[PDB]
Amino acid sequence: VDDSMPVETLEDGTKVFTSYLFGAGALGYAEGQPEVPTETARNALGSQDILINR
Amino acid sequence: VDDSMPVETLEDGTKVFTSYLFGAGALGYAEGQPEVPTETARNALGSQDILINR
Secondary structure (H helix, E strand, O other), X not given: OOOOOOEEXXXXXXXXXXXXXXXXXXXXXXXXXXXOOOOOOOOOOOOOOOOOXX | XXXXXXXXXXXXXXXXXXXXXXXXXXXXXXXXXXXXXXEOOOOOOOOOOOOEOO
């Protein structure tokens, strides 16, 4: 059960629901890597600090 | 022997050569020093890195 799925609308306020039926278990994905996966910088004449992810 | 020497060009496809004759040993020069002879920085929000010499 999830609240976020594609839902469309036609005129006269009628709705259409999608509801994928997968039951697969599964497809696949992998994480991989960049370089510099995380970093921090700052602005000295001001006062700030940052984060990055990428 | 060197390939790079001043070579001028006139019309009529007539080349002209220079060929310094020195046998000096020598003229002179001195090294000198800056401060910050070498440095490395980077942009944060973007992905870059740099080198400098000066």
